[PDB]
Design a protein around this ligand. Structure first.
Ligand SMILES: [Mg+2]
Lengths: 271, 269
């Protein structure tokens, strides 16, 4: 009886009716299932030139691919890219015409993390190869990705550190090209409707179960599958943090970051 | 009464919430015995950089709000980074927190890339309090009295001819202070939520010293919605209220959320 949705628990018609009746004015609207063309992007760096292999990556890619596909997203997976190539790929994704007939997107980045951003494949101390988190939000913003204006953009980042001070986030501050937008694109908020969810916790290896996925990605998939039907995604992220509250060996506490969501994002699995 | 402008949560409303989600709501303390503390730090008068007009209306608005929500408010004004740090460290050590369920910290100043401007700041010899330092001073190691309790941080840190007050990043030996092993095994940073506005100062001229729109909008939403919405959502709704821009676009961000539960203020209780 299971199908496109896999192991994601379905929101019944009754359930969906209730959520929408109660808060429709502040729920991101979703598009008709039959005609919508949802897109997602996973970029996973596993094999690196000068830094450790990320054993566990393939289980994560497979799990997140399955998850997002079960939630209705056409998932485009890219592997072992330089920051330069990650940039080129981001811009292409941002420019896909399918987003015009979509209601939302997910972007997943799985790689090594340092203070300054996400490590590309050719990264070393001498020769840097870093994707700045900021560039993700910029390339998907209102001006650079007008097809996703007013639509939620969920950015999941697994950027495990090791000895370094995780991923830094947060600051507090040439002229661009005139592309002659209608004054309603011009006057829109540059950045709006983003939510990020970030883990920089290193992996604990089990040699008995090598190849196995990161606990973060596993815990996220588990919670998405169980609670996509009843909770909006902000709340699902909070519940992942709740699940990690009593520490085991390796303490995990992923942070929700750069929230410019204006409405609740419900996934309405089954619809 | 003591709540004034804040709409009160009712016993039926308040029991509604609690029954629905008590296992995932931050518990609040008995009203008669809790001693809630909040801190406002505002730099408005500066040596070298522009005077921030309308600060006093914001201070007064935020103080009243926090008092209405059940917090005793200490306000500190025009401090160097060094003095702000001293004050924050003092705030963290107050015994009241031992008998409290939560806190709010408010920072209002000029902001740059590196963090919040202090009174003596110039681009020639900076004076900046790092946002990181705020979280560190209130974290589990350094402020054990607020472990497992919500710590709301509001930063109004207006941008100059500058790209912003940026956050984030992913990833010298400290003094050994002999913490209990339960403190050592605890999550170092948990139960925080920041709401940040980095919008520049436009100034009213026929009628000056009239508050900032961010703070006004936050206060209005807290008054309206504390009786039915957790702070997270209240912060969402302020964003919702700014969706169609006025002249000066404002979209304040929620940042560094390690909240594991929902923080209902339950005004009136
Ligand atoms: Mg919520």
């Amino acid at each position: 009886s299971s199908g496109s949705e896999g192991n994601v628990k379905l929101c019944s018609l009754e359930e969906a009716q209730r959520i929408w009746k109660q808060k429709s004015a502040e729920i991101y609207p979703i598009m008709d299932k039959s005609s919508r063309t949802r897109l997602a992007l996973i970029i996973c760096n596993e094999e690196f030139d000068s830094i450790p292999r990320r054993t566990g990556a393939e289980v994560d890619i497979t799990g997140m691919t399955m998850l997002l596909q079960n939630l209705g997203y056409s998932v485009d997976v890219k592997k072992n890219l330089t920051a330069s190539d990650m940039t080129t790929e981001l811009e292409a994704f941002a420019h896909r015409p399918e987003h015009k007939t979509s209601d939302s997107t997910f972007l997943v980045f799985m790689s090594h993390g340092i203070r300054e951003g996400i490590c590309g494949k050719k990264h070393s101390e001498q020769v840097p190869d870093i994707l700045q988190l900021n560039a993700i939000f910029n390339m998907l913003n209102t001006k650079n990705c007008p097809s996703l204006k007013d639509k939620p953009k969920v950015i999941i980042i697994q950027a495990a550190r090791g000895d370094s001070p995780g991923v830094v986030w947060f600051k507090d501050s040439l002229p661009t090209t005139e592309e002659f937008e209608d004054d309603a694109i011009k006057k829109a908020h540059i950045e709006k409707d983003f939510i990020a969810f970030c883990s920089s916790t290193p992996d604990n290896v089990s040699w008995r179960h090598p190849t196995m996925g990161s606990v973060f990605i596993g815990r996220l998939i588990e919670h998405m599958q169980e609670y996509a039907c009843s909770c909006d995604v902000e709340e699902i992220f909070r519940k992942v943090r709740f699940s990690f509250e009593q520490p085991d060996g390796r303490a995990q506490m992923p942070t929700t970051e750069r929230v410019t969501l204006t409405r609740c994002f419900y996934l309405f699995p089954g619809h």
